[PDB]
Swiss-Prot record:
It is linked to Optic atrophy 14: A disease characterized by visual impairment in association with optic atrophy. Atrophy of the optic disk indicates a deficiency in the number of nerve fibers which arise in the retina and converge to form the optic disk, optic nerve, optic chiasm and optic tracts. OPA14 is an autosomal dominant form characterized by adult-onset progressive reduction in visual acuity, and pale and excavated optic disk. Optical coherence tomography discloses a severe loss of the retinal nerve fiber layer. Belongs to the SMCR7 family. The chain holds residues 133 to 462 of 463 of the full protein. It is a single-pass membrane protein. The gene is MIEF1. One of its GO terms (cellular component) is mitochondrial outer membrane. It comes from Homo sapiens (Human). Changing residue 69 to D: Abolishes nucleotide-binding, but not DNM1L recruitment. This is Mitochondrial dynamics protein MIEF1. Homodimer. Interacts with DNM1L. It is found in: Mitochondrion outer membrane.
Length: 325
């Protein structure tokens, strides 16, 4: 067996989600999203929100192995002249890709109630919606027309709803509060290290995945397929699960800037280059976002975690087949 064959087999038998399970899980999310729009509009009339919408690999057909999770973005409405955002590189935290949202001027904002010390706290905003999720046990049977049962998730996932749809099938939808100031999009997705957990996170995923799609659509290439394999590999072990979709996506994107030919027969070649690149970034302790180079996507990892990942992947260019096992 060529590495090529083993890669395609692994994708087919391990990475890929059955088209049925995949489409069905997506439709569950779509259905619930539409329901939560109507209901929460009446359940929280005072709260300045845009329409909520779905986001994540399940929505993008980049989810792997099993289809069980998706984000529901909750867009806060902010009066643009009552708030400004401060990029981390200009703060004392000095963390690019993470923002402060500072309260400004006069006026009143509904969201003043989540401001502490003159800043809109992502955690305080998150707590407003932990309340909403916990309150879901008071709601009527939403989606009961399409035989869905919505339940707050088992602790400690205080922002997650559990949706059971027939039968013994569950989809986990977490609320992801978001703010848009000018053209900067931020989400309350805590920095992995707690010190930075009250900084807002710059939303990079939509632009990352759009770039990935556009590149593959231009030439029917295999960038997405190679990515999905990596994502499923990194879901295989505890060690490798410290690697993220975003990190792997940007590994691919960087490699795409160097390699134009992503024909399906080049998959094994690209997979090794991807591993190679991944090892270099880990060696350097730096993986810059392809779309915003100022942002090091490895900056939520401790240097030891980074060294251990490097160790975990040390023999991968010469025993790659081992990752598929
Ligand atoms: N619009 C968005 N902006 C920023 N982050 C997002 C957005 N949608 C989802 N995310 C985040 O991206 C991560 C999931 O990325 P994803 O590609 O779904 O990886 P996986 O398939 O491994 O779950 C989650 O931590 C989630 O909070």
């Amino acid at each position: 067996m060529s590495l090529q064959e083993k890669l395609l087999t692994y994708y087919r038998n391990r990475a890929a989600i059955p088209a049925g399970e995949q489409a069905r899980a997506k439709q569950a999310a779509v259905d619930i999203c539409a329901e939560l729009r109507s209901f929460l509009r009446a359940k929280l009339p005072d709260m300045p929100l845009r329409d909520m919408y779905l986001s994540g690999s399940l929505y993008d057909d980049l989810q792997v192995v099993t289809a069980d999770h998706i984000q529901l973005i909750v867009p806060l409405v902010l009066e643009q002249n009552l708030w400004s955002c401060i990029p981390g590189e200009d703060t004392i935290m000095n963390v690019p890709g993470f923002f402060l949202v500072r309260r400004e001027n006069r006026g009143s904002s509904y969201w003043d109630r989540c401001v502490v010390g003159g800043y809109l706290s992502p955690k305080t905003v998150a707590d407003t919606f932990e309340k909403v999720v916990a309150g879901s046990i008071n709601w009527p049977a939403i989606g009961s027309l399409l035989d869905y049962v919505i339940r707050p998730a088992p602790p400690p996932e205080a922002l997650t709803l559990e949706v059971q749809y027939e039968r013994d099938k569950h989809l986990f939808i977490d609320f992801l509060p978001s703010v848009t100031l000018g053209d900067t999009v931020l989400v309350a997705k805590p920095h992995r290290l707690a010190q930075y957990d009250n900084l807002w996170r710059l939303s990079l995923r939509p632009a990352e995945t759009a770039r990935l799609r556009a590149l593959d659509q231009a030439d029917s290439g295999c960038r997405s397929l190679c990515l999905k394999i990596l994502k499923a590999i990194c879901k295989s072990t505890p060690a490798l699960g410290h690697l993220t979709a975003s990190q792997l996506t940007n590994v691919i994107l960087h490699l795409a800037q160097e390699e134009a030919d992503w024909s399906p027969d080049m998959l094994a070649d690209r997979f090794l280059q991807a591993l190679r690149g991944l090892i270099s970034y880990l060696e350097a302790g730096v993986l810059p976002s392809a779309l915003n180079p100022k942002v090091n996507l490895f900056a939520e990892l401790t240097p030891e975690e980074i060294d251990e990942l490097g160790y975990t992947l040390y023999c991968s260019l010469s025993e790659p087949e081992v990752l598929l096992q």
